[PDB]
Amino acid sequence: LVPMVIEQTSRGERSFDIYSRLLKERVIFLTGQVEDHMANLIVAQMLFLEAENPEKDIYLYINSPGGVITAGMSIYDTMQFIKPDVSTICMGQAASMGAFLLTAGAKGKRFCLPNSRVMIHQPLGGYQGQATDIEIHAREILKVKGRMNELMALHTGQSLEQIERDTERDRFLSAPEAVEYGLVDSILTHR
Amino acid sequence: LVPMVIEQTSRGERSFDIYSRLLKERVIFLTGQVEDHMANLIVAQMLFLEAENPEKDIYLYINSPGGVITAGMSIYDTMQFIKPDVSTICMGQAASMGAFLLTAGAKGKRFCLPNSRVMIHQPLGGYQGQATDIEIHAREILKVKGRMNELMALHTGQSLEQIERDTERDRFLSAPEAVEYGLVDSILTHRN
Amino acid sequence: LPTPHEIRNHLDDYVIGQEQAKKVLAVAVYNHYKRLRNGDTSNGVELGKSNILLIGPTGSGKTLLAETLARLLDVPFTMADATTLTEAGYVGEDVENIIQKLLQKSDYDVQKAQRGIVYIDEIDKISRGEGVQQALLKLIEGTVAAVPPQGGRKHPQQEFLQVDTSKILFICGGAFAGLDKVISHRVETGSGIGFGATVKAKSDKASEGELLAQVEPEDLIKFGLIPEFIGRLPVVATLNELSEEALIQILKEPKNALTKQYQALFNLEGVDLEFRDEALDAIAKKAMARKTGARGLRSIVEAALLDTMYDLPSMEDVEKVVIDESVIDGQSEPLLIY
Amino acid sequence: YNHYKRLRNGDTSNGVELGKSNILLIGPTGSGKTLLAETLARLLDVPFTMADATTLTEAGYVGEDVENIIQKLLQKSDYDVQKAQRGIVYIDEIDKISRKSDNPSITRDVSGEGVQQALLKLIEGTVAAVPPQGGRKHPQQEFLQVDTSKILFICGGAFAGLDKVI
Amino acid sequence: LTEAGYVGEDVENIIQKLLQKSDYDVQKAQRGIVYIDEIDKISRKSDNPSITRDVSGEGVQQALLKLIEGTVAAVPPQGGRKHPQQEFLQVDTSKILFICGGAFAGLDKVI
Amino acid sequence: NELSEEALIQILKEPKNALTKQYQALFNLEGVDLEFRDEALDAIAKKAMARKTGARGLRSIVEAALLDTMYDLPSMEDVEKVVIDESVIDGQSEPLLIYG
Amino acid sequence: LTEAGYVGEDVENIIQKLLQKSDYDVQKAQRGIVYIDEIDKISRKSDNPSITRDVS
Amino acid sequence: SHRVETGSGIGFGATVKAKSDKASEGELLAQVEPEDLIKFGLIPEFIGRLPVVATL
Amino acid sequence: RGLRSIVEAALLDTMYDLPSMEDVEKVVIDESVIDGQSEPLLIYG
């Protein structure tokens, strides 16, 4: 049961859920496995905030053990498409898809907590059917892998070759390691 | 279900949930298996209270059997980041994750009820796959073990070596024993 | 009709730390008097009244600025409160009553009374009653209000004195505590809860001084003020705050300083008084915590000097008296010289 | 111009009795509605005054009475009912008197519908008991019979939201 | 018109207006005609209990109940020349015809 | 009908009791002429429309622009005329002062 | 005490009463003291329709 | 009291104020200010003219 | 009472300019003027 918070102003008092109250401050919560339904909700929040103010920055708190790749690209493309700079803050952890969205944030506005764990790996997929269909799907997932690595290299700043070797297998990273790698810009230790 | 309550204010009578009413008084309830969904809810509550009054303290009531480390670690970093002190009270029990958050509270403000039981153990996990992958995950969980023990030693004040030996297996600590170990400071036997 | 610079000098004698606000009031009041002074109105053009709007914290000197100007340029001065007129019942009677109060000090002279300076405070409270603002704007824009002639048991409608409010200067002071948040949202980042937000609520409010200086009509309408009322208040003066050090200066720097008042009282008695600088910070610190601004200074000093005032007349051989920070705390007794 | 003609034609040699037509200025705030009324007093020969509808309230309540409108018109007219009868009146903020929606009227709305009911006879023309000055209606005989049949009325207000209705 | 004891005008004032046309002649006034417009305005707002006193509404009707059938109304002698020695005139409305009229908006819904 | 940006500019100079003429007369009696350039009138109207204050807001805009000069002009001497332009409205440049 | 011109009382008579005690000597009268008891009973109140005017 | 009453908390570490030690007229009137007197009905100018306040 | 509004609107512009006109002996109003498509006829002597 989400709690209700009261916002008091001269005009009057309004009651909001904890998640909706923070939305007014351009704070979006990314939680759980990435999927079409949850991703669609996050996209709606980005467009809504863009209409209210296309200049103010938007904050994105990422805590998720990855998920569907297609759903993730919708969020990534939306962030780059809209004019407002989307800040990314890693809470708890950021898996393959979470890390891609984390590093996708605006340059200089990517943060992570000191004890956060960042893990990056190559895409996972499978197909059952005829050999001809397998080649079609196998070519598709490989293109996605190369495409994702290219984007990660762009934001991180590392070479494409270095990103391929590192992302071949699961590579757990810490907050200080992420800073040097390029996934994030700075750590938010204290206020 | 949750029983509604009435709060009297200058404007007039107002209706509040039992949990929401306590949230207005800087009281957060940590209950059940620690998971990503509930952790983000607690984090949102903390950040909201910080804006209202960063000077006033926050009271976290911990009654849970533990859970995920990643989810629990998001609350620890939030508590240390915000300026207001986060008071931790142990109700019923505080397992591995509940104990880390309990001892992580502000120095001198950590409390525990007399009949509460505080249990601490080392992280547990598992992986299935190739030997190469197992080595990667085995190194990761071991680093987390050292990370958690390092922080636990800082708050409790005990040496890292002692914490490592004590947390090698499940260890149950009563409310008085926790005071000596350093997990808490005082016991709230009766209101004074 | 002194120049604005000269008017500012007089205000500086009694008010300190609000130099910027003095500039706004000096030029605004100069124009109002200039219009009255230029009563000939030879050219067809008609001059329009300009009303000031003072936005500052409690005990910042809003009220003191009103009467100080009247003292320089002798004119009747009256004060009113928005809370008094929020009844919303027969508002016409109370608004004209304000002019009746002004006429008491103006010898019931319409010409002299028209030049008076009216002051109002706590305007934020009515902002949200909406109806009371409808009546208030008429008074500022200009309206003729009939008043009885110098009291009397009774008088006919013919003898009733009618005074035009168009020639009277109205100062609607106020303290908008919540307006600072609205300005920060519009001007600064619109984040107050997140990690990147600014929640440095140390109570210093140093930013509030320059933040409130950016006041625009947009922030006022959000506060609940109607646009029509805002339009009748073109001039805006903003006081930032009274600092702890500023309070120490107010204790002695003003002409009619608080310390000088008590010092004179002791001097005629036959014993001099000395106020150490250490005692001043103790008094200033107490006022800051109480949040009364300069108002609390009088009460704090009177209580500290109450004990000595009771025994000093009966006592003798006290050549001089000295005060220190210990006396302000109450643990110590004022030092006596023999 | 027609108003002056009616006063000029006060003799009424013909059997026909000239009627009165009132104006309703509907416009957004800041469009000069109030300015138009103020710009007429300069040239207007007959007494003219301005008032606010929000202050007005139904009779028998602590807010105000509509008869007070004539008191203001009498101030300019030197309390002479003869010439005041040939005056003009302006009523501002008439939009606030409208009922909002779905009201059963059990509350006996005073600020709204009550004010309209009292003005009805006033606009078309009826004798009104006006106190001398600064007085409220009471059993006392301090009243002045004023006729509003020949007094023009110009109700001006900013009907916010009317565009959506249209 | 409003209930007695309130700021609004009293019901008895109607007789005073009729005495101005007849030169304050009680005999000629007792046989006069009266017209009360906007009678629909003084109506209970579909609330028989009437929690709050409807001085402007229901109260006016109660005051007029005895006036229409007949009552010895009291009014000033001659426009209140001097408040001392009022000697309020006695006027009986038993023979005074009354013609009330108003537009009852919403009555069609009831019928 | 609601006022437009072009109409606001007309209101500043065309009316007999125009806001500009009020300040001009205030300065003329002192002995210093006053002039407003068309570039400044357009900026003043834009600010009112930008802030939605309307015609009433024009007084506030003029007050702020001439706040500095009105304070120092009486004390100052040898000021024959003052010239205002769009640069004054934004605050980047102080109002030009002509010396005799 | 009530507003001037009303049946209740006039505030100005307080000074006259002080003179009777001092035998009308302006010199010593100015050195007198006044005690207005029940000051809270004249607290401002909202307008009442039934009452003609709030004299107090 | 409405102005200087801190209020009662709900948590374990909060301070609960029972009706026994709620408040009293003594020690409450001593904290009187001009703003509270104005609400009672006294004129603000009247209060300003009376700086000395003797509270029993 | 609605009739007065219809007539005033139709003759609003006419009455505004009628005094300035010269030798206007008669005026005629027809159905074409009510809807607004046409303007009232002005006869000059």
Ligand SMILES: Nc1ncnc2c1ncn2[C@@H]1O[C@H](COP(=O)(O)OP(=O)(O)O)[C@@H](O)[C@H]1O
């Ligand atoms: N600079 C100053 N010098 C001397 N006295 C001051 C100064 N500032 C404030 N005061 C005193 O403190 C009071 C502050 O309260 P006031 O001006 O009435 O405003 P408010 O009604 O907002 O409290 C002044 O009226 C005056 O008595």
Ligand SMILES: Nc1ncnc2c1ncn2[C@@H]1O[C@H](COP(=O)(O)OP(=O)(O)O)[C@@H](O)[C@H]1O
């Ligand atoms: N065309 C105009 N010329 C001059 N002033 C105008 C004009 N239009 C509007 N105003 C301004 O509008 C105000 C008068 O109307 P206003 O008070 O806004 O009406 P209302 O009270 O009906 O909203 C004044 O500030 C006046 O100068």
